[PDB]
Amino acid sequence: QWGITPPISTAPATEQENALNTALINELKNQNLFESPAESEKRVKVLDELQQITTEFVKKVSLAKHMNEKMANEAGGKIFTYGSYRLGVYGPGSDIDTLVVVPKHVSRDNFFQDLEPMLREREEVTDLAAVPDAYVPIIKFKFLGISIDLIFARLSVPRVPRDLELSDNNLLKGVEERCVLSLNGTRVTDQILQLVPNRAVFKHALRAIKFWAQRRAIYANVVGFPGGVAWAMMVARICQLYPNAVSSVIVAKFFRILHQWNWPQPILLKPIEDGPLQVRIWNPKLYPSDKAHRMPIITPAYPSMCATHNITLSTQTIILREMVRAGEIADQIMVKALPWSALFQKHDFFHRYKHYLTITAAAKTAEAQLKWAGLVESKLRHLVTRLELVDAIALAHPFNKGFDKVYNCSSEEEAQQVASGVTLEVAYESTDHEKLANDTVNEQIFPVYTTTCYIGLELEKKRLDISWPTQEFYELCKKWDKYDDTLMNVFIKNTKNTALPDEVFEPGEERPK
């Protein structure tokens, strides 16, 4: 048996199921989701280079601390990957989540002070940006064009050999807090792969489920939809229930099992374990915050945590409705009444609601806007919850990405009025602030940089009053310890479907008629 409960079926795939499995993979190819072998080989080469830079880095530190040559050559140091790349389900151009593990005499200070300069001196490295203040400290860069998100963990051992595995829970003892967090992603990815009956079947099924979720716009953790890890664990759970199936069957059965699931019963890939640390483990019977989780997807590595903390009543409802819809499509696919492409039809978010909320973050520099827009976006789920409590609002559906604009205002007064939400007729251009700021590094108008998020409003059966929700949200954002009242502002507006700007419809997409 795989997983905690008995399988639904152990039968081999039928001939028809095998044929639909080939058709599924053909549609994933049709969607161009597989990178070329050349790009795959380039990723292996980049990871091999990072492993050599890691050994060089650890050796340099060891020698600077007066270790002898022999011991400095034994200190080791190892690169790991996790996330989509490690799971083997990543699209062309995707980032590699990467972790460097080092022995106890190499510190997080050496990471940013010693390894960072070593990367900057490589001709293959571009777009290098260190972010030591993040929740998980990180160094971001491209190596030969491959995007790397590099995090760091120091172990309490004198040597990190090339064959080190991170599964033993005791490896967490004596490790600093941020290093324990940096180890979790790799420990989680490895366990998921170990807990499914057939890794090849799991990967194809996850690729389809992930693409479906992105096409339906229910793939963003920050606003309360499941993220990559959460979708991966959901697919893994279904794989456990069909240990002898092919990917077509996993996908076809996935939707109904999960929208009929007895929420909030958790998705667990294995029993929750205890460990040698003194840290909280997910437990609704001890912690009220864990009891409030609506669709808990629990990570299997000690210490277990819920990967879907952010889900609200609204996003729970959207997720379930999307699964109901997909289950009925999959039913038709598996009797050959519809092609697989029918499952991947894009959302109609900007066609389906009569009333939207626009939430705009604005700033006077692109660099300030990037952090401020991120902050405002991260608070949307709290606005969603308060909007639900408005008697007239049944559901507040957040879209899963923001839209960047730049206004080239003619005066400081006009720029102030644009940033505060008195954007009348002032012209703007659609842009990408992240690309602008990065271009500036690699290098009278008063520009205002804005990022707008959208919430679709489902109103109760029988003008809307959102005064308190709006006031509460402004105050929550402006409590940010980095909020700068000379640079940043935020405003909410009501927007009818007919008033949606052209930006929200992709190139060649017709507006609602």
Residue numbers in the entry: 14 to 456, 475 to 493, 500 to 550
Give the original sentences from the paper that presented this experimental model.
The S. pombe orthologue of the human PAXT connection, Mtl1-Red1 Core (MTREC), is an eleven-subunit complex that targets cryptic unstable transcripts (CUTs) to the nuclear RNA exosome for degradation. It encompasses the canonical poly(A) polymerase Pla1, responsible for polyadenylation of nascent RNA transcripts as part of the cleavage and polyadenylation factor (CPF/CPSF). We report crystal structures of Pla1 in its apo form and in complex with Red1. Taken together, our data reveal the molecular details of recruitment of Pla1 by Red1 which leads to hyperadenylation of CUTs, serving as a signal for exosome-mediated target degradation.
To first gain insights into the inter-domain arrangement and interactions between the NTD, MD and RRM domains of Pla1, we determined the crystal structure of the protein in its apo form. The middle domain is formed by a four-helix bundle which is capped by the N-terminus of Pla1. The C-terminal RRM domain contains additional secondary structure elements extending the canonical βαββαβ topology of RRMs44. A large interface is formed by a network of interactions between the three domains of the protein burying a total surface area of ~2982 Å2.
